[PDB]
């Protein structure tokens, strides 16, 4: 039925008829990053005496 909708006909003669396309799908988001360091002292301004 996908072939008949590609050809826009109801009779499909013999032969290979390139229907759709395919492609496995990703399944994650692994967003690696550089182990942070210089992590500011926001406390200086938020915890002054």
């Amino acid at each position: 039925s996908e072939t008949k909708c590609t050809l826009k006909s109801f009779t499909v003669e013999k032969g290979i008829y390139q229907t759709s396309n395919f492609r496995v799908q990703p399944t994650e988001s692994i967003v690696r990053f550089p182990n942070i360091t210089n992590l500011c002292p926001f406390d200086e301004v938020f915890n002054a005496t």
């Binding site: 390139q18 396309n21 492609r23 990703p26």
Partner: protein, 49 residues
């Protein structure tokens, strides 16, 4: 693969690409014509026995 060449993975793109009409159908039809003739070229040169 017209969709994978232009857009590439993205899916928000696919709805935008549909707005240009049948350009991707024309590319597949044109290239299939070449693909079928290249095997016939070989049969006509060698398959004469």
């Amino acid at each position: 693969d017209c969709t994978m060449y232009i857009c590439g993975d993205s899916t928000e793109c696919s709805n935008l690409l549909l707005q240009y009409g049948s350009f991707c159908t024309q590319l597949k039809r044109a290239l299939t014509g070449i693909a079928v003739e290249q095997d016939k070229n070989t049969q006509e040169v060698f398959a004469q026995v």
